[PDB]
Amino acid sequence: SEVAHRFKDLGEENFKALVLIAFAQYLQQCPFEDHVKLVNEVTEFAKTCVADESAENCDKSLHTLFGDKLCTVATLCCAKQEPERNECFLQHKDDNPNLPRLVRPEVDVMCTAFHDNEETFLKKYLYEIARRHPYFYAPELLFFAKRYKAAFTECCQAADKAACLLPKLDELRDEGKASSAKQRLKCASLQKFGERAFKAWAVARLSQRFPKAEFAEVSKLVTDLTKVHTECCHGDLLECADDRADLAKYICENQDSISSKLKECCEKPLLEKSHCIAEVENDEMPADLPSLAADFVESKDVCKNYAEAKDVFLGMFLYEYARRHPDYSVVLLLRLAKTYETTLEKCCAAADPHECYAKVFDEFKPLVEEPQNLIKQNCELFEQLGEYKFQNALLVRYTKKVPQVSTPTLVEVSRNLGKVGSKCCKHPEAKRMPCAEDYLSVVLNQLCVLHEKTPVSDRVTKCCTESLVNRRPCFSALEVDETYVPKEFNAETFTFHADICTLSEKERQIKKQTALVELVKHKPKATKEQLKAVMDDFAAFVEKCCTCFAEEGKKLVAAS
Ligand SMILES: CN(C)c1cccc2c(S(=O)(=O)N[C@@H](CC(N)=O)C(=O)O)cccc12
Ligand SMILES: CN(C)c1cccc2c(S(=O)(=O)N[C@@H](CC(N)=O)C(=O)O)cccc12
């Protein structure tokens, strides 16, 4: 009995939480009550299987049981069976659920509702998040919940609760988005490009993290990490949590053979331990490391070793180059790896292989400099413009690259792209590239998945599917869509006045930024000067007006 199996391993508290998340991720539009009803009904069944491990259906698989339970309400896929039935659900998860934005009541209410029923208060939290982030790494969602519970347990019992709660809540809201985004990239990678692509990502990443680890150790880590993520992303949340639990147990036992930063991590509670390992900083780089050119360029057995086991061999190259380059982004390491593999592939067939692949590190020169130069440039501009203006610049730049993309998606992505400047430009040259390049992959993957829903730009499709590690370069190369035909003006498409006033400060920029997009979709060929000009005026119509809706706005459309 697979269910009984897992119920024991995870206990009841987690089992309940994990199944609530799975449901809230498969049927994101269903009310809280229904999921609650199904979790309990499901939980009871689990309890009876613990006893008689042969009580009617305790033999069935998790999918079967979860499927049948959801179909008792999903009729608000179910026509299919076991394999097809599950895949169906997976293809219908929605990255952009049009749910009502969540609004936070007065601190007073939250505290009362928390104190009264704590288990309910926390379940609805997990519920709200899971439905909005159908791919959130389940195991980490429990860490946020515990961290969420601590916020209230401490603040609701203090002088100025609000001053205590709000900040801590903000911090969580953000980090949750970051976490959700990182996770979305791992799943996309697994689902769209295959496990080979995720493994490569892992080797490079863990190699940078655990420089001291021997190649076969990392490989061991990579293989399990892959299973964990493969399972969470496919919805096998219980087995994900389990395997994720083992992996942490393992990593802590074998500490010394891995990294010397895993100390602080391995002496705390499961959840906290897991989160700690996953985010552990890189380990100090080994003292005496032979130059790479030794076994990978100069040696004359390259093609032989490549022929025998291209996988392991290339795998080794990645590990070696990565372990000593924590100043490189994972994506740059995968590009280099791809360039090396391509070189051997051709060189090895040639007459004198050695002569052909002897200058491979000169092929790397351009690949390493491109990111550095791009980053150096963009942080300069950033420091000169500030976050807001910098976001505006990217808004214009991106709308010109892919005009078809919907305004809400352009606004969301450009704003996130701007945040990369705030998060990374502060770090020193040394840590900029991992920060920047890896962050840009997460944000451009957001654009790619939101776009995969309703595709309107072949230039976006091509950059998103041609290659995973080259997405950023593909997008950066785009300039302005020359075949794009401008759009006509639509009165209501630039609509507002006073209702925008009650709106927060940020809610206002997101209003001027939305207009800016619309404007460029109208005047593609316009210039940085013009827009920057017509922009200022936009503020005016906000202060003046704040019926001027129609009046002050008429003097706006005219001048526009
Ligand atoms: C604790 N065990 C089980 C782990 C779980 C999830 C990710 C882990 C990672 S990781 O490198 O994938 N860490 C991820 C973050 C994450 N939460 O997945 C990253 O830096 O992109 C390394 C080592 C252990 C991990
Ligand atoms: C760290 N920060 C400042 C950035 C460095 C390099 C590229 C960045 C990009 S990007 O990948 O879109 N790169 C830009 C390059 C340019 N401005 O000419 C683009 O394609 O429009 C977006 C946001 C921040 C970036």
Asked if 135 and 156 touch (Cβ cutoff 8 Å), the reply is no
Q: How far apart are CA 266 and CA 255, in angstroms?
A: 9
Distance 178 CA to ligand 2 centre (A): 19
Reported as half-sphere exposure (CB side, CA atoms, 13 A), residue 189 has a value of 25
Contacts of residues 247-255 at CB distance under 8 Å and 24 or more positions apart, as own/partner, are 247/221, 248/273, 248/274, 248/277, 250/224, 251/221, 251/277, 252/277, 254/217
Task: Tell me, using a 6 A CB cutoff, whether residue 42 lines ligand 1.
Answer: no
Give the residue, out of 180, 274, 438, with the most ligand 1 atoms within 8 A of its beta carbon, to mutate for a pocket test.
274
CA 389 and chain centroid, separation: 25
Count CB neighbours of 69 within 10 A.
Answer: 18
- Closest among 264, 247, 293, 512 to 388, alpha carbons compared: 512
Residues 6+ apart with CB under 8 A from 188: 445, 448, 449
Spatial distance between the Cα atoms of 383 and 404, rounded to a whole number of angstroms: 30
Distance CA 473, CA 449 (A): 18
Domains belonging to the chain, first-starting first, are 1-94 (1.10.246.10), 95-184 (1.10.246.10), 192-283 (1.10.246.10), 284-369 (1.10.246.10), 370-481 (1.10.246.10), 482-553 (1.10.246.10)
Residue among 303, 342, 377, 306 nearest 470 (CA):
342
Q: Is 208 helix (H, G, I), strand (E, B) or coil?
A: helix
- 231 is annotated as contributing to ligand binding: yes
In angstroms, the CA 2 to CA 65 distance is: 11
Structure tokens at 202: 């892992």
How far apart are the CA of 334 and the centre of ligand 1, in A? 18
Ligand 2 site residues (CB inside 6 A) read: 374-375, 378-379, 382, 394, 397, 417, 420-421, 424-425, 436, 440, 472, 475-476
Q: Report the C-alpha gap between 91 and 86 in whole angstroms.
A: 9
What count of other Cβ atoms lies within 10 Å of the Cβ of residue 352?
A: 9
Give Cα 117 to chain centroid, integer Å.
33
| Single-letter residue type at 188 | A
- Type of residue found at 233: C
Q: What amino acid is encoded at 318 in this protein?
A: L
Q: Which of 246, 313, 251 is nearest to 277 (CA)?
A: 251
Nearest of 336, 278, 285, 321 to residue 469 by alpha carbon? 336
Cβ of 130 closer than 6 Å to ligand 1, yes or no, is no
What whole-number distance in Å separates Cα of residue 69 and Cα of residue 191? Answer: 26
**Which pair of structure tokens corresponds to residue 268?**
């705390």
- The Cα 42–Cα 37 span in angstroms is 9
Distance CA 258, CA 277 (A): 11
**Torsion over CA of 537, 524, 404 and 194, rounded to 10 degrees?**
-100
Q: Is 227 annotated as a binding residue?
A: yes
Nearest-angstrom CA–CA distance, 218 and 323: 11
Handedness of CA 423, 425, 427, 433 (dihedral sign): positive
Atom of ligand 2 nearest to the CA of 394: 21
Which residue do the tokens 């087995």 mark? 239
Residue 304 to residue 288: CA distance in whole angstroms = 27
Token pair 């909005």 in the structure block, residue:
132
Ligand 1 contacts CB of residue 151 (under 6 A): no
Rg, Å, the chain Cα set? 26
Give the resolution to one decimal, in Å: 2.6
Ligand 2 center–CA 378 separation, angstroms: 6
Closest ligand to the CA of 199? 1
Experiment type = X-ray
